[PDB]
Amino acid sequence: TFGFLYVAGYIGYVGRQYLIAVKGEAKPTDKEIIIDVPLATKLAWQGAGWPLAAVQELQRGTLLEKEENITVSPR
Amino acid sequence: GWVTFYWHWKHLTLWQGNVAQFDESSTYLMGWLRDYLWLNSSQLINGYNPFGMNSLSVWAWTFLFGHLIYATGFMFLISWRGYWQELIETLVWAHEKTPLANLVYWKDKPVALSIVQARLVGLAHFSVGYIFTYAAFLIASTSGRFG
Amino acid sequence: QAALYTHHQYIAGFIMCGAFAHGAIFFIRDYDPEQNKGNVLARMLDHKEALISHLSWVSLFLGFHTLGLYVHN
Amino acid sequence: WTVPTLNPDTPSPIFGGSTGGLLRKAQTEEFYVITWEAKKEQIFEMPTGGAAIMRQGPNLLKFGKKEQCLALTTQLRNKFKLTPCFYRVFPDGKVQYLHPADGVYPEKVNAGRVGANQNMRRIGQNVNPIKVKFSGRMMSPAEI
Amino acid sequence: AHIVKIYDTCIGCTQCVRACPLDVLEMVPWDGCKASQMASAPRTEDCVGCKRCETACPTDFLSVRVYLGSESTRSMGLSY
Amino acid sequence: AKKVKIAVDRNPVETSFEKWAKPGHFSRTLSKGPNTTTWIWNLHADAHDFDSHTSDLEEISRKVFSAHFGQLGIIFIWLSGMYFHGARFSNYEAWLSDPTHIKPSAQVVWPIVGQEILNGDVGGGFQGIQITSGFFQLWRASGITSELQLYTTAIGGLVMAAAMFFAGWFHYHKAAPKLEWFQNVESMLNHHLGGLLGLGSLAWAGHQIHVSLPVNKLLDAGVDPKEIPLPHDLLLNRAIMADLYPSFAKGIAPFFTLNWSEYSDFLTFKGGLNPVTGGLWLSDTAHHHVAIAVLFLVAGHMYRTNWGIGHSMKEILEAHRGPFTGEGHVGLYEILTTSWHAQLAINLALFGSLSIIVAHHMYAMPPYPYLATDYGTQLSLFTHHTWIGGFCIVGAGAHAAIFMVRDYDPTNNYNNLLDRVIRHRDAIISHLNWVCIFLGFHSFGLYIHNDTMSALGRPQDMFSDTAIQLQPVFAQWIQNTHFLAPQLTAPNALAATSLTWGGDLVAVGGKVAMMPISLGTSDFMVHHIHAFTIHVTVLILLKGVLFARSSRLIPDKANLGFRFPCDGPGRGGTCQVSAWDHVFLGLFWMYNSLSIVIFHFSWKMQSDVWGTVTASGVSHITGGNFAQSANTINGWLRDFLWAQSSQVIQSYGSALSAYGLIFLGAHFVWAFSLMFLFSGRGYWQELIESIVWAHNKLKVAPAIQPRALSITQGRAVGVAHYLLGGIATTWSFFLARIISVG
Amino acid sequence: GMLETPVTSAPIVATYLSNLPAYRTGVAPVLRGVEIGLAHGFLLAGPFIKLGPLRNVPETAEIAGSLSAAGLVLILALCLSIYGSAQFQSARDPLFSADGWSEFAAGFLVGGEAGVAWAYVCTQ
């Protein structure tokens, strides 16, 4: 069980870091169909410590976005 | 369907005194296909055949009746209105141009079923065929075994 | 025994679909947001995305792994 | 500008006919007539299928529904730079001029037109369906 | 007949009128938008409900809305 | 008169990887990059739609021409692989010695995660997957005897593959033909008839006379494959050939002196089958290919190119006009020299029809040695080539419709055949509609009648051979005529073309190769099911073509294009009015029709043809139960599906277990497709909104906005998975059944 | 406008149709139904006699086949009756009227049943 959750979170955490990193570029969508391999490779190696990094974001209040910035439909 | 398949097969093997067949075949899906459906259809599909018929012929007939209604429903679910409305227009043209038949005429202009109506009718055929097919299989496979 | 269990479970299945159907009809025809301001019913609409997305996660997990285990066997 | 009067004597484009034309509805309910002036003989596509040749000068065709007349109007206007008009003709002989309604095509704003079916609010400002319940029939909150 | 309504978010771009295959809509003078024109729906007895007008509308949310109603020979698009 | 000549442009397109790194470059809409996931799907759907990227006909033609070299390159790689796997991963050499008792095999799986069970004991001291493509029987017919010969062909295939890919690059980037080059239809037909087909047949006849016949003559005499002279020894030593065929002692003089009767020893008209191998006499095929070569070389001199003589195809068409059809064939030459879609519509229709003919003619007149008694190969080849034909025919409907929307022009088609067909399309479709209803009632209704009478215990009231009879007397009469042809109407033929007409069976290795096929009531009923299903498929496809541009429902459908989802919920609802949607519905009906065709073939051959031959007689695989059972739906469900699925559902733990897995996998893919066919994107887009909210909440929302599939893609996905699952199900069912009892 | 063909517009075809009782105006609607009834009643007995459930019985076949055909004539007459009730509620040819169609339907029943009876007499 814990073997899977470590690898699964590794994949998820690395992908999330890449997504956030490229959203500061001039054309974010171009970095999603043409992968920035040098950037992707660096993030892959640093994902071995995701359980520590994820907790710090959770404790720092930066893991989640605020409700005022999330679009929703009328209710 | 999953719930009742489960209930039925577990009781068929209990009623036959061999729970091991369920315990060993239910862990993979070929087991359900081979040992539940295929194996227990034998008496049902022989209700009538070239050599005669027996009291399971009604269930054999209903079994195929269920498959037919089920499949007819696929027509309404897959093909949608615009195709049929165009088709009916050629039939409207043909009727008015046919001698001895254009003397008769409709009071309601024929049209294809509506978009919503097709979904309901198609679901109705799907559902009725679903129910009848299983009912025939359930009764025939149980009573034939224990009747 | 087989006919009775199958008969009532299918009827239960249809009845449950109707219950949710008329729950959806209620929200359109009868629900009044002003007269339910801030109560539990109006708050269900406030986190409908959370409810739907978690139902989606549960269904995905069960589907992937139940089908996966059957196929593995 | 004044409403034109239909001239039934107008010649029609050269066309051998088809099975896609008028039906019993024209005899009993209504049909449509489109007319236009052609600068030269030219081949155009019939909305009911096939090719026809428009005669130089006045032309006249008859169609079974309004959309067919306007479909040919769009073709003539955009591909040949013509100015057609069409009518609704009832079995008892009455003629109702239809298009362009006031002599100016609708896409061009014209003076003297009175707005219809205009709500002075956004879509998001419609009331809930519960407020129009039991109004005598089925009606949307957009109908108030 | 179907019900067609124009809302005050219209920018008077005329695209709904150009897209209507039945000539249901037209442009009338207005003062609420920069173009000084608003879409109008004078002839809704001919609307077939295709919603090409809604497809053409650029505003968000729509400024022209079709609500499908009772069916007649015209609204059904029958030629028979 | 324009001279037929070579004309190209030098260096039209620079060879560079710049555009490889710019996805969507070919289209003005997509070249700006994605904003939503729909862009990704659109990139692939439009990639080969060349005419939607430009209006220049020359630019389109050049892309077509080089795309074709690409296709040929891929086919050569595929062929090279088959020959290579025959050279390195097969039991072909062992099979050549004992063809009846060894199963062909040319695929070997690695031992990993227990999958090596799939390497079955196929004989010849070899383990592997049993192939049903028939390559072993093809290779023996051509005279191949060693793995070295197979290996050399594989190398040559790669050299050809490289040459094809070079030609594609060369003729697009370096020397691209001009539009006038492509429009030399007279010259193209002369070369493709006289050159491609005529010389190709002559050359192959040359191989048969000098290699296939001598080698197969010695193989059928019991000579060991390694003691047979190598093919070049036969070529260089006339004495060796003269021993096998004495006429070779006279050289080529009899051919030049018109003493052609001298070659009767290797150019024959035997007919029937070789009793040793169960296939056609190779001396008959060699004479066939010689005669074909002459016919096509004559045909290749019909059209005028540069020397006055020959026919103008335009002049032929314009001359054939009659009282009933207006201007007739005027304008067709212009259409067929300016529209690729028009050309593709005709070529796909006949190429697909040709494929179905190949399926029938190869089962009835098996052209390869030891093909007839390899029941697994016979069933596979017939099924395979039937499906290709069906798919190709549907593509003909699709591209006829595309021509109708994009390339058709009224100014060039006034009162000609094309114009006049459009002007009575309601008459055409209305009558075809009636025929389908008549055929549906009086063909499928007969089965329903039979099922009901049988269930009610009134077998005497059924349509059957022992009851009310429906004899296909016309088909029975034709069979008798063909069986008696050698006596009167084909005096120089020793035997009839096929044993299916009548006569005596041919047994090879204790099994029936071919034998007469009797046609009773069950055969009458199933043939009118075939007539019904074909007519409906035509109805759907023809309607889509004739109403592609307009209808009484949508007067301006042409402006909406070939492929669009609908024109809105108005007019009562107009879902699936477009021509593309008719191809979509036509695919289902094509699948329904050809499923019954192959079920007809499978059950009839097992019941009445295939079987073992012993002293007591012929015992068929299913014991001749087709005649009395195939006249009820319950008969097909019980005696065919339920009974013959025993092999596939019992294959777990054996070398055939892979077919058991695919059998279930294909059922899954089929059912998975119903999710796309029954639902609509509006539901899925709203579902994706909630899932996007969760990704937004965690700052993991993608920059390319997720979108549900377009309406049209939802249909394309649905039918693609429906067909793949349905066909792959029957594929597993057939192979597991026939490889086990065959 | 419309597509004219030899089938649609021919002299031999047009003359034949005008001779049929359906298109023969100036004849009482009741007489029209009788002539149409007789023609259809006579042919209807055929398939029932030769292909019914009692076809193989020596003498019962003729009675059962014709008796079943008579039942189908009654059903057809009822269909004509209700059609007139629906179609004509609110002109040149009296047949296309509420009173005319009712008379026409009545004639079809009498003619149809007589035609079935006459067919039975021919068999035996």
Ligand code: CLA
């Ligand atoms: C106490 C039970 C109950 C009651 C009082 C109602 C009442 C109502 N429902 Mg609800 N509903 C129920 C249960 C109930 N429902 C259940 C169990 C379900 C789930 C199946 C639903 C699902 C549902 C939906 C989805 C909708 C309603 C709607 C309605 C309204 C209109 C019904 C109508 O006109 O039907 C007319 C009924 C018919 C024309 C007949 C339908 C026949 C079906 C398809 C089965 C046919 C079987 C076939 C003939 C079998 C042949 C067998 C063969 C061998 C011969 C009404 C207020 C509708 C509405 O607008 O509500 C506001 C609506 O859209 N209901």
Ligand code: CLA
């Ligand atoms: C057997 C048929 C079938 C299958 C397998 C599914 C599967 C699914 N449906 Mg669907 N559905 C079906 C029929 C089916 N449906 C039908 C007939 C209808 C009626 C129209 C619907 C209507 C419907 C609705 C309305 C909804 C679903 C939903 C779902 C999801 C449920 C959760 C789940 O299982 O997640 C796990 C996923 C799966 C089991 C899907 C299969 C995954 C495979 C095994 C992956 C294999 C990958 C592998 C590498 C091979 C790739 C090869 C390829 C690259 C060539 C899932 C994607 C719900 C959903 O989206 O929930 C989130 C949902 O809202 N379905």
Ligand code: CLA
């Ligand atoms: C190395 C040589 C080379 C280079 C650098 C180029 C470069 C170019 N070519 Mg040229 N071309 C070449 C070789 C080359 N070509 C060859 C060998 C052929 C013959 C087939 C052609 C035929 C050709 C045509 C007809 C066209 C071009 C075009 C182009 C341009 C866009 C290419 C593009 O987007 O490719 C990216 C595309 C791909 C990577 C797809 C590759 C497809 C090939 C056939 C392999 C597919 C095999 C695969 C296994 C299929 C099954 C998949 C399945 C297993 C999943 C660009 C200037 C296009 C253009 O716009 O020119 C102005 C154009 O229309 N080329």
Ligand code: CLA
């Ligand atoms: C006798 C001459 C000849 C021959 C043999 C061919 C053969 C072929 N042509 Mg045709 N063609 C010819 C003359 C010829 N053509 C002329 C004169 C014109 C101009 C009017 C055309 C214009 C033309 C077009 C526009 C197209 C073809 C295509 C084809 C291919 C169709 C697919 C097929 O059957 O593959 C069977 C395959 C084989 C038998 C393999 C044969 C390979 C060798 C190298 C011979 C190829 C023929 C070539 C002319 C040889 C010299 C080339 C060069 C070095 C001088 C086929 C290879 C289609 C194609 O796929 O093109 C790529 C295609 O699109 N041809």
Ligand code: CLA
């Ligand atoms: C395309 C098909 C084809 C081909 C290639 C051949 C080829 C051959 N046949 Mg066959 N044959 C065929 C069809 C074919 N046949 C058909 C259809 C029939 C039935 C009518 C026959 C019936 C038949 C018979 C009955 C016989 C042959 C024979 C032969 C061989 C000798 C022919 C001969 O005398 O040529 C005469 C001369 C030429 C063909 C001209 C050769 C020109 C050379 C290549 C020119 C090279 C010039 C160049 C500059 C050199 C450069 C050198 C370099 C090192 C610098 C030869 C291998 C004979 C044989 O011995 O078979 C074993 C024989 O007896 N054939």
Ligand code: CLA
């Ligand atoms: C000689 C054959 C031939 C040729 C050259 C073409 C060429 C063309 N066709 Mg046509 N077509 C053909 C046969 C052919 N067609 C047949 C047989 C059919 C019937 C099925 C059709 C039906 C058809 C339609 C309905 C349409 C076309 C269209 C097109 C155009 C665009 C194609 C494209 O971009 O594909 C891009 C390719 C893909 C997106 C890949 C598709 C892969 C399929 C869906 C699944 C393959 C599964 C695989 C075989 C097995 C499973 C693998 C998996 C497990 C990994 C192009 C002009 C389109 C158009 O608009 O033309 C103007 C169009 O809409 N064709």
Ligand code: CLA
């Ligand atoms: C088993 C399923 C099924 C059935 C029965 C049908 C039936 C039909 N389809 Mg459909 N279709 C289906 C599935 C089915 N389809 C699916 C899945 C799709 C989606 C791909 C389509 C898509 C489709 C298209 C696109 C078209 C058809 C067409 C047709 C018609 C063909 C003409 C015909 O044979 O009429 C006769 C009817 C039958 C043979 C059905 C059985 C008739 C029974 C045996 C008669 C019983 C009589 C008895 C007195 C009943 C009394 C009952 C009670 C009142 C007492 C017919 C109505 C074509 C059409 O309309 O052609 C004109 C057509 O264009 N279908």
Ligand SMILES: CC1=C(C/C=C(\C)CCC[C@H](C)CCC[C@H](C)CCCC(C)C)C(=O)c2ccccc2C1=O
């Ligand atoms: C087949 C089909 C048609 C054509 C079908 C039509 C026009 C219906 C024809 C029905 C005839 C009259 C037979 C009716 C038989 C029923 C058993 C009658 C039941 C009546 C109840 C009152 C009991 C559509 O109009 C359609 C529309 C939208 C999506 C899909 C489809 C669709 O699939």
Ligand SMILES: CC1=C(C/C=C(\C)CCC[C@H](C)CCC[C@H](C)CCCC(C)C)C(=O)c2ccccc2C1=O
């Ligand atoms: C299920 C379904 C969907 C939902 C299906 C969708 C959105 C397609 C999903 C495709 C893939 C799985 C998503 C994208 C995958 C990416 C390429 C990333 C892959 C990552 C791996 C390589 C790890 C529709 O959008 C739809 C639309 C119209 C009619 C019916 C339906 C329908 O039935």
